[PDB]
Amino acid sequence: EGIINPPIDELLEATDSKYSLVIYAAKRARQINAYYSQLGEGLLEYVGPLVDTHVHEKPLSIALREINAGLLTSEAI
Amino acid sequence: LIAQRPSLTEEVVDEFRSRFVIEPLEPGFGYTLGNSLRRTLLSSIPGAAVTSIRIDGVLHEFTTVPGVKEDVTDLILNIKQLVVSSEHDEPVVMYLRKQGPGLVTAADIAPPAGVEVHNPDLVLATLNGKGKLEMELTVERGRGYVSAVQNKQVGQEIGRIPVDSIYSPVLKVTYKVEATRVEQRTDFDKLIVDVETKQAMRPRDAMASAGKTLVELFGLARELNI
Amino acid sequence: MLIAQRPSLTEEVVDEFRSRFVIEPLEPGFGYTLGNSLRRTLLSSIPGAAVTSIRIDGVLHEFTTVPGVKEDVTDLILNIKQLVVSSEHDEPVVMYLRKQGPGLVTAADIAPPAGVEVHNPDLVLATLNGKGKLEMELTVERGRGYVSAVQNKQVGQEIGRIPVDSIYSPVLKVTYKVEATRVEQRTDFDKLIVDVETKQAMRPRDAMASAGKTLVELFGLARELNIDAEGID
Amino acid sequence: QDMVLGLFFLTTDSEGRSPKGEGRAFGSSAEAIMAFDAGDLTLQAKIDIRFPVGTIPPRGFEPPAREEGEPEWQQGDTFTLKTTLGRALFNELLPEDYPFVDYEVGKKQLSEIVNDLAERYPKVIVAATLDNLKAAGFFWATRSGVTVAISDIVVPDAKKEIVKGYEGQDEKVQKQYERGLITKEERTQELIAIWTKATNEVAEAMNDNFPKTNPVSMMVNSGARGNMMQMRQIAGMRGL
Amino acid sequence: FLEHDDANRALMGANMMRQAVPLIKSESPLVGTGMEYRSAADAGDVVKAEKAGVVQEVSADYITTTNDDGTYITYRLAKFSRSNQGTSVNQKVIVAEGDRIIEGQVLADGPATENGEMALGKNLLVAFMPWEGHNYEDAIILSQRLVQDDVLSSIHIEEHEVDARDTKLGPEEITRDIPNVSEEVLADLDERGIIRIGAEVVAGDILVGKVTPKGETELTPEERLLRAIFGEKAREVRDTSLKVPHGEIGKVIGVRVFDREEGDELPPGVNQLVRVYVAQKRKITDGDKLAGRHGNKGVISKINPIEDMPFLEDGTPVDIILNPLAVPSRMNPGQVLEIHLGWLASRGWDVSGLAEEWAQRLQVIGADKVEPGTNVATPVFDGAREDELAGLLQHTIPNRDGERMVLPSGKARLFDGRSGEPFPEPISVGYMYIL
């Protein structure tokens, strides 16, 4: 029930840096928002929320929850 | 270990000040009991108060009625310390009318059947020979304090001006504790509550209403369990 | 005039003895009236039973050592006052405990008389080295709240007898915190959270029932002044 | 300003008030709160208190133990401890794994444990513990009873005498300047040095006069706010 | 008690007192220096008499006096007229009908004045203690009685005006028939397009309806279609009506209209000018800066209910709490000294035949037998010495039933209103003048 609901220490050890984490959650949040705005096209490349979602929610909040599970993977190019 | 049931005893020190005491209460419990009783008695007691007025030839509280040395805003303040009691659950109009020179007092306001004013001596304003005062008052009943901002409900009636209302008829409350004469190490305490109220209602039914409110709240703990 | 939303006590259990209780929307300022009054009575008014004096053979009050037992008197006094007992005689009752040989004496091996029940036989009282020689009798008494130890000349009648502080209340501690909640676009509504931790004899939800009943009669004493009505439900 | 003052009152030894119910043994920390509620025990008083399982004892308590013929590991099981009820209350705010702290907390030691927590513990625990300290600190600052009054600020009794002695000492220099034996510039330097010494002397007399339990000294000794020279010029002379 | 204050904080205290707003019912300070009266009369807000006569006709708007020769002069009292900073300069009337007057005596009371004495604030019951952290770092705690009983509340009069200027395309019209508006928005507008007197307004409401004469509109195809569909008329006008500024409320009190065609003189171009006076009654709320005389100031942080306030042994809840942590560090113990003398002024004192040393200087002064509520004056550098205040505190009159609620030290017993259990040690308490 707060911003601090996914703890930061668990998130930090997954990404090994701090600046890496913010862009990584933000890139994912951009994707999931873009998925919700298909409105009927149903393009294959986009992927929806992996975890369950509240009736109203912020896409960035969903993204951070996915990192804590650790299912999502990031790679620098 | 000893079983002794609580007992309330009452005594009158004044027509609107009274002492109530409970003799046998548990140790370290007298202070807490009196405070719970005080907090309820001060906060929520039903009473009645003026919630709006109307003056002829006046469209807001800032202007002045010709002939009266007291300004309309001063009349709003001065009316606020009038004390009334209303049995009707619905709003009731009250009428004040005065011509000629003299001191307009709360006595002059005509009360409809079932609403009685209790401080006739209170002064509203002073009129010279040329003045003329004619006022309508609206009495409602409620509890607590409600600001004028929520009191405004009629928009087309420009003549009406609302006033904040103080319903609670209790003036102050004071509790003390001591130690009982009964011979134990525990030293059971005897709470003593002093209640002072306005002339609207007796302290007996006032503290009765306080007891009424609390038993529903404290009953909720027990009945919802088991 | 009627209350907009009726409150409702709810229960949340975290252990077989500790539980938490939440009160739903309540009138502004009432979180503290109800909250602090509930805490005191639940801690004090509820009756129960616990020991009140102990008697060990062949020891003095100043003679803090006891032969044949590794532990001292203070750890023995501490452990015994911890023990919970349910009694219904309503008069002082004496409980005997005689054990010899090396080992560990527990609350199970005590033999209670009729109408006295020991709830927690697991508790460890003393450790014995060599020949045990442990013989000790204590006095159970039904009581209310908490009372400090006093000298009733029991030392004069028999030097071995000593008083002890007694915990009659089945509840151990109650911590209440009041927070605000927002209901129908108004946030001036107080939610009360009462955490009750109680000893093994009584179940905490039943404890609040006894505490609740004691308050209703005590505040229903003010109804007798005059019959009056208030908007409810 | 307030939190640190509250915790200082909460964790301090006896004699700060009348230490009722001091020097006794209690079954558990819960029972001490029961005694406190009845009024027999007071918050600042040395007492023997038992302790539930999992609470780490002091770092120097790890080698010693209770008396038994068997090896024991007192680090996370029951153990009595010589402390005050307030210190027992204060430690419950800190996380469970943290070793016990038994000294008066002040400000320097308070900053230390927050710094210690930030090093050895995750971020969330540090943020949560500060909120617990805030709530406890504010609650006990109210109950601490610091105030200000005309009788709280006690002027040094000796002061009046001390100032007069220096004036007589001063006045010979004024006298021996009237006869021309000393230049004014040298006189100004010598007088400033004489006055500077006087301010220290009246400070020391005042510092001895004040009792440790009064409000004005308490909120400076604790590190809450203020400084010694500020307190000097409210009761003793301001000086040059 | 200026001498007890530091020079730095006294600077702030003297500067603040040029910022106090007038209140609905002004009250003279219970304790304060004697110069406040002279400062009022010499300044021009209070209305004094130029003759020694008999009042003949008393009324709110005007007062008539008659001198011994026979000449009548009628003072016309200002009533609710805006100042430069937007505060009322309302004038009260203090004299009754048949009172005799002497030259220079005060006939009409002014804004922030009382009986001809200066009065910039009220005198509240203050208690010094930290209280749950709501008055941490200079913030203030106020009992809800002050909002309820209108103790700290001030009128504020705003004035805003518009001009109907003649431009190249045509003239602007002050009119009710504004285009593309609903029916209920222009409900309180009068006939000619001016809001009626007494019409409560909110943010965004239309005060005076005004419409621009023309615009050159190059309509897009969709707008062209819409004009055909809705059966509209463009009306060759756009709305430019005066509207209530954002975050503003108030009851209209007066409108002035100036017309070119009338005898009234206007700037070039302006056919019509209208000014509207919107007045509101602000109540004391959180964030509203409050302050004393000795440079102690803070924002309100919380307004507790009257029950939650820490009350006295006789049930009287303290009207305001103040942190003690501020006082030693800022070096203004004058405010504590004022508090002690304020308590003595509120509850009187008796010294009769006591023959005491501190009393002897006072005995020639006459300040020995003092009734409750009466004012006392301590000049700015010949004020009462600390021996007198210590002594006076010892012998305060029992207010009711025979007990003195404040101890000789100047501190009293406080029952916590919330938990109920008494605070462990006494608390300083008294009456302080708050602006």
Side-chain angles (χ1 to χ4, degrees), chain D residues 101-129 131-142:
Chain D
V101 282
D102 200 71
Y103 37 90
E104 182 181 83
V105 83
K107 175 68 179 300
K108 298 278 270 283
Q109 310 98 301
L110 202 38
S111 72
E112 182 254 354
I113 56 177
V114 181
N115 205 43
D116 184 30
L117 281 180
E119 172 79 40
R120 308 202 287 106
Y121 280 77
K123 306 162 157 262
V124 192
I125 306 294
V126 186
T129 42
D131 296 343
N132 292 355
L133 292 197
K134 172 199 63 182
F138 281 152
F139 177 76
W140 285 107
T142 317

Short mmCIF file of all heavy atoms in Angstrom, two decimals, chain D residues 101-142, unseen atoms left out:
data_model
loop_
_atom_site.label_atom_id
_atom_site.label_comp_id
_atom_site.label_asym_id
_atom_site.label_seq_id
_atom_site.Cartn_x
_atom_site.Cartn_y
_atom_site.Cartn_z
N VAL D 101 21.05 -2.47 24.20
CA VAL D 101 21.77 -1.25 24.56
C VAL D 101 21.28 -0.83 25.94
O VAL D 101 20.08 -0.75 26.18
CB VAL D 101 21.58 -0.13 23.52
CG1 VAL D 101 22.46 -0.40 22.34
CG2 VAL D 101 20.17 -0.07 23.04
N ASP D 102 22.22 -0.59 26.84
CA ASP D 102 21.88 -0.40 28.23
C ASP D 102 22.25 0.97 28.78
O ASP D 102 21.94 1.26 29.93
CB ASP D 102 22.57 -1.51 29.04
CG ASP D 102 21.95 -1.73 30.39
OD1 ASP D 102 20.83 -2.27 30.43
OD2 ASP D 102 22.59 -1.41 31.41
N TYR D 103 22.85 1.84 27.98
CA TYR D 103 23.25 3.14 28.49
C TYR D 103 22.25 4.23 28.10
O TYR D 103 21.42 4.05 27.21
CB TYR D 103 24.65 3.52 28.01
CG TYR D 103 25.02 3.12 26.60
CD1 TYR D 103 24.78 3.96 25.54
CD2 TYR D 103 25.65 1.91 26.36
CE1 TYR D 103 25.13 3.60 24.26
CE2 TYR D 103 26.01 1.54 25.08
CZ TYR D 103 25.74 2.39 24.04
OH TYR D 103 26.10 2.02 22.76
N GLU D 104 22.31 5.34 28.84
CA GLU D 104 21.54 6.54 28.55
C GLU D 104 21.85 7.01 27.14
O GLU D 104 23.01 7.02 26.72
CB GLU D 104 21.85 7.63 29.57
CG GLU D 104 21.09 8.91 29.40
CD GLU D 104 21.47 9.93 30.43
OE1 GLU D 104 22.49 10.63 30.24
OE2 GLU D 104 20.77 10.05 31.44
N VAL D 105 20.82 7.41 26.41
CA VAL D 105 20.96 7.42 24.96
C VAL D 105 21.48 8.75 24.42
O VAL D 105 22.32 8.74 23.52
CB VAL D 105 19.63 6.95 24.30
CG1 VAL D 105 18.57 8.05 24.15
CG2 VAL D 105 19.90 6.22 23.00
N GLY D 106 21.07 9.89 24.97
CA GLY D 106 21.56 11.20 24.55
C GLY D 106 21.33 11.48 23.08
O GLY D 106 20.28 11.15 22.52
N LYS D 107 22.33 12.05 22.43
CA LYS D 107 22.29 12.37 21.01
C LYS D 107 23.40 11.70 20.22
O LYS D 107 23.15 11.20 19.13
CB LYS D 107 22.35 13.88 20.80
CG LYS D 107 22.42 14.33 19.36
CD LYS D 107 21.14 14.03 18.64
CE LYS D 107 21.20 14.49 17.19
NZ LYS D 107 21.43 15.95 17.08
N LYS D 108 24.62 11.72 20.74
CA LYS D 108 25.77 11.09 20.08
C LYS D 108 25.57 9.59 19.95
O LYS D 108 25.80 9.02 18.88
CB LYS D 108 27.04 11.40 20.85
CG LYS D 108 27.38 12.86 20.92
CD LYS D 108 28.08 13.32 19.67
CE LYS D 108 29.59 13.18 19.81
NZ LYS D 108 30.17 14.26 20.65
N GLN D 109 25.19 8.93 21.04
CA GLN D 109 24.94 7.49 20.98
C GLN D 109 23.74 7.17 20.13
O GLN D 109 23.69 6.10 19.51
CB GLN D 109 24.73 6.92 22.38
CG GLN D 109 25.78 7.31 23.39
CD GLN D 109 25.36 8.47 24.26
OE1 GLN D 109 25.07 9.56 23.76
NE2 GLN D 109 25.33 8.25 25.57
N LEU D 110 22.75 8.05 20.10
CA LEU D 110 21.58 7.87 19.25
C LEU D 110 21.94 7.93 17.77
O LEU D 110 21.42 7.14 16.98
CB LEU D 110 20.55 8.94 19.58
CG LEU D 110 19.09 8.71 19.25
CD1 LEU D 110 18.74 7.27 19.48
CD2 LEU D 110 18.29 9.60 20.16
N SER D 111 22.78 8.88 17.38
CA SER D 111 23.27 8.96 16.01
C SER D 111 24.07 7.73 15.63
O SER D 111 24.04 7.30 14.47
CB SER D 111 24.10 10.21 15.81
OG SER D 111 25.35 10.07 16.47
N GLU D 112 24.85 7.20 16.57
CA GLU D 112 25.69 6.03 16.33
C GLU D 112 24.88 4.81 15.93
O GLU D 112 25.24 4.12 14.97
CB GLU D 112 26.54 5.75 17.56
CG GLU D 112 27.48 4.58 17.40
CD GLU D 112 27.03 3.35 18.15
OE1 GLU D 112 26.03 3.46 18.89
OE2 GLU D 112 27.68 2.29 18.04
N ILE D 113 23.81 4.50 16.67
CA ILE D 113 23.07 3.27 16.37
C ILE D 113 22.32 3.40 15.05
O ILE D 113 22.10 2.39 14.37
CB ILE D 113 22.14 2.86 17.52
CG1 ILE D 113 21.16 3.96 17.88
CG2 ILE D 113 22.92 2.50 18.74
CD1 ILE D 113 20.20 3.55 18.94
N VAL D 114 21.90 4.61 14.68
CA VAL D 114 21.30 4.80 13.36
C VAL D 114 22.34 4.59 12.28
O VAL D 114 22.07 3.99 11.23
CB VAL D 114 20.63 6.19 13.27
CG1 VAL D 114 19.99 6.37 11.94
CG2 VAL D 114 19.58 6.32 14.33
N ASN D 115 23.56 5.09 12.51
CA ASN D 115 24.67 4.84 11.59
C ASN D 115 25.03 3.37 11.56
O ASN D 115 25.37 2.83 10.50
CB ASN D 115 25.87 5.68 12.00
CG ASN D 115 26.79 5.95 10.87
OD1 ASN D 115 26.36 6.26 9.77
ND2 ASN D 115 28.08 5.82 11.11
N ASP D 116 25.02 2.71 12.71
CA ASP D 116 25.29 1.27 12.78
C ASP D 116 24.24 0.46 12.04
O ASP D 116 24.57 -0.51 11.36
CB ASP D 116 25.35 0.83 14.24
CG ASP D 116 25.71 -0.62 14.39
OD1 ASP D 116 26.43 -1.15 13.52
OD2 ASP D 116 25.28 -1.24 15.38
N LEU D 117 22.96 0.81 12.22
CA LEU D 117 21.88 0.13 11.50
C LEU D 117 22.01 0.27 9.99
O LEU D 117 21.79 -0.69 9.26
CB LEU D 117 20.53 0.69 11.94
CG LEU D 117 19.94 0.20 13.25
CD1 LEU D 117 18.63 0.87 13.48
CD2 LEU D 117 19.77 -1.28 13.23
N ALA D 118 22.35 1.47 9.51
CA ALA D 118 22.48 1.72 8.07
C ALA D 118 23.57 0.88 7.44
O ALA D 118 23.50 0.56 6.25
CB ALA D 118 22.76 3.20 7.82
N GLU D 119 24.60 0.53 8.20
CA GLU D 119 25.69 -0.28 7.68
C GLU D 119 25.30 -1.75 7.59
O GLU D 119 25.46 -2.38 6.54
CB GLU D 119 26.93 -0.09 8.54
CG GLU D 119 28.06 -1.02 8.21
CD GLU D 119 28.84 -0.57 7.00
OE1 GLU D 119 29.07 0.65 6.86
OE2 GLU D 119 29.23 -1.44 6.20
N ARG D 120 24.82 -2.33 8.68
CA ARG D 120 24.65 -3.77 8.79
C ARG D 120 23.28 -4.29 8.39
O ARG D 120 23.07 -5.51 8.40
CB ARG D 120 24.96 -4.21 10.23
CG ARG D 120 26.30 -3.71 10.73
CD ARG D 120 26.83 -4.55 11.87
NE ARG D 120 26.10 -4.33 13.11
CZ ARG D 120 25.24 -5.20 13.62
NH1 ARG D 120 24.99 -6.34 13.00
NH2 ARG D 120 24.62 -4.93 14.76
N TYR D 121 22.32 -3.44 8.06
CA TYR D 121 20.95 -3.86 7.83
C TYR D 121 20.45 -3.33 6.50
O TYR D 121 21.02 -2.39 5.94
CB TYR D 121 20.03 -3.38 8.97
CG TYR D 121 20.11 -4.23 10.20
CD1 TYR D 121 21.17 -4.12 11.07
CD2 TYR D 121 19.11 -5.15 10.50
CE1 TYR D 121 21.24 -4.89 12.20
CE2 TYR D 121 19.18 -5.92 11.62
CZ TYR D 121 20.25 -5.79 12.47
OH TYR D 121 20.34 -6.55 13.60
N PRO D 122 19.39 -3.93 5.94
CA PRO D 122 18.82 -3.42 4.69
C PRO D 122 18.14 -2.07 4.88
O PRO D 122 17.85 -1.65 6.00
CB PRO D 122 17.80 -4.49 4.31
CG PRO D 122 17.63 -5.32 5.49
CD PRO D 122 18.92 -5.30 6.19
N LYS D 123 17.89 -1.40 3.75
CA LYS D 123 17.38 -0.03 3.75
C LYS D 123 16.00 0.08 4.39
O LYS D 123 15.71 1.07 5.08
CB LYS D 123 17.30 0.52 2.33
CG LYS D 123 18.58 0.46 1.52
CD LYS D 123 18.26 0.60 0.04
CE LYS D 123 19.44 1.09 -0.75
NZ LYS D 123 19.35 2.55 -0.99
N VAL D 124 15.13 -0.89 4.12
CA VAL D 124 13.75 -0.85 4.60
C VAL D 124 13.69 -0.87 6.12
O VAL D 124 12.84 -0.20 6.73
CB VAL D 124 12.95 -2.01 3.98
CG1 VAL D 124 11.47 -1.83 4.22
CG2 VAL D 124 13.25 -2.11 2.52
N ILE D 125 14.54 -1.67 6.75
CA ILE D 125 14.61 -1.74 8.21
C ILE D 125 15.02 -0.40 8.81
O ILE D 125 14.50 0.01 9.85
CB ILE D 125 15.56 -2.86 8.64
CG1 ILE D 125 15.14 -4.17 7.97
CG2 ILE D 125 15.58 -3.03 10.13
CD1 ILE D 125 13.81 -4.68 8.43
N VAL D 126 15.96 0.29 8.18
CA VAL D 126 16.42 1.59 8.67
C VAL D 126 15.30 2.63 8.61
O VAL D 126 15.12 3.41 9.56
CB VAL D 126 17.66 2.05 7.90
CG1 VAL D 126 18.22 3.32 8.51
CG2 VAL D 126 18.70 0.97 7.93
N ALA D 127 14.58 2.67 7.50
CA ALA D 127 13.48 3.63 7.37
C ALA D 127 12.36 3.34 8.36
O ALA D 127 11.78 4.27 8.93
CB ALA D 127 12.94 3.61 5.95
N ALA D 128 12.01 2.07 8.54
CA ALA D 128 10.95 1.70 9.47
C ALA D 128 11.31 2.00 10.92
O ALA D 128 10.45 2.40 11.70
CB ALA D 128 10.61 0.22 9.30
N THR D 129 12.57 1.75 11.33
CA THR D 129 12.97 1.96 12.72
C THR D 129 12.90 3.42 13.14
O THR D 129 12.59 3.72 14.29
CB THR D 129 14.37 1.43 12.98
OG1 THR D 129 15.21 1.77 11.88
CG2 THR D 129 14.33 -0.04 13.11
N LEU D 130 13.27 4.33 12.24
CA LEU D 130 13.21 5.77 12.52
C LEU D 130 11.80 6.23 12.84
O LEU D 130 11.60 7.11 13.68
CB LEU D 130 13.76 6.57 11.34
N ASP D 131 10.81 5.69 12.12
CA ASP D 131 9.42 5.99 12.41
C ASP D 131 9.02 5.52 13.80
O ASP D 131 8.20 6.16 14.46
CB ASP D 131 8.52 5.38 11.35
CG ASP D 131 8.76 5.98 10.01
OD1 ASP D 131 9.37 7.06 9.97
OD2 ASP D 131 8.34 5.39 8.99
N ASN D 132 9.50 4.35 14.21
CA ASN D 132 9.23 3.88 15.57
C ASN D 132 9.85 4.81 16.60
O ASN D 132 9.23 5.12 17.62
CB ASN D 132 9.76 2.46 15.76
CG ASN D 132 9.00 1.43 14.95
OD1 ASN D 132 8.01 1.75 14.31
ND2 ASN D 132 9.47 0.19 14.98
N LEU D 133 11.08 5.26 16.35
CA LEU D 133 11.75 6.23 17.22
C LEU D 133 11.02 7.57 17.27
O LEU D 133 11.02 8.23 18.31
CB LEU D 133 13.19 6.42 16.78
CG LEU D 133 14.13 5.23 16.96
CD1 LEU D 133 15.56 5.71 16.88
CD2 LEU D 133 13.89 4.55 18.28
N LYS D 134 10.52 8.03 16.12
CA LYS D 134 9.74 9.27 16.07
C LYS D 134 8.52 9.19 16.98
O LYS D 134 8.27 10.11 17.77
CB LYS D 134 9.29 9.55 14.64
CG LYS D 134 8.31 10.70 14.53
CD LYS D 134 7.56 10.67 13.23
CE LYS D 134 6.71 9.43 13.12
NZ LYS D 134 5.98 9.36 11.84
N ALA D 135 7.73 8.13 16.85
CA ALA D 135 6.50 7.97 17.63
C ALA D 135 6.79 7.88 19.12
O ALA D 135 6.11 8.51 19.93
CB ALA D 135 5.75 6.73 17.16
N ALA D 136 7.77 7.06 19.50
CA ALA D 136 8.14 6.94 20.91
C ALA D 136 8.74 8.23 21.45
O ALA D 136 8.49 8.59 22.60
CB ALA D 136 9.13 5.80 21.09
N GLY D 137 9.55 8.91 20.64
CA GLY D 137 10.19 10.14 21.09
C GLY D 137 9.20 11.26 21.37
O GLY D 137 9.32 11.96 22.37
N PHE D 138 8.25 11.46 20.46
CA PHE D 138 7.23 12.49 20.64
C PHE D 138 6.32 12.20 21.83
O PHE D 138 5.91 13.12 22.53
CB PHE D 138 6.41 12.64 19.38
CG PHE D 138 7.08 13.43 18.32
CD1 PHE D 138 6.79 13.20 16.99
CD2 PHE D 138 8.00 14.39 18.64
CE1 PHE D 138 7.41 13.92 16.02
CE2 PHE D 138 8.61 15.11 17.66
CZ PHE D 138 8.32 14.86 16.35
N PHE D 139 5.94 10.93 22.00
CA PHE D 139 5.06 10.53 23.09
C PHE D 139 5.68 10.82 24.44
O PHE D 139 5.00 11.29 25.35
CB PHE D 139 4.75 9.04 22.96
CG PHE D 139 3.91 8.48 24.07
CD1 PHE D 139 2.56 8.72 24.13
CD2 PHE D 139 4.46 7.66 25.03
CE1 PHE D 139 1.79 8.19 25.13
CE2 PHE D 139 3.69 7.13 26.04
CZ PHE D 139 2.36 7.40 26.09
N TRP D 140 6.95 10.51 24.60
CA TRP D 140 7.61 10.72 25.87
C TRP D 140 8.11 12.13 26.08
O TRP D 140 8.36 12.51 27.22
CB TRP D 140 8.76 9.73 26.03
CG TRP D 140 8.25 8.39 26.34
CD1 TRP D 140 8.22 7.32 25.51
CD2 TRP D 140 7.66 7.96 27.56
NE1 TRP D 140 7.66 6.25 26.14
CE2 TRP D 140 7.30 6.62 27.40
CE3 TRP D 140 7.39 8.58 28.78
CZ2 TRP D 140 6.70 5.88 28.41
CZ3 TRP D 140 6.79 7.86 29.77
CH2 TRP D 140 6.46 6.52 29.59
N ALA D 141 8.28 12.91 25.01
CA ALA D 141 8.58 14.33 25.17
C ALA D 141 7.45 15.07 25.87
O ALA D 141 7.70 15.99 26.66
CB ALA D 141 8.86 14.96 23.81
N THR D 142 6.20 14.72 25.56
CA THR D 142 5.05 15.26 26.27
C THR D 142 5.11 14.92 27.76
O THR D 142 4.99 15.79 28.62
CB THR D 142 3.77 14.71 25.66
OG1 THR D 142 3.88 14.75 24.24
CG2 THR D 142 2.61 15.54 26.08
#
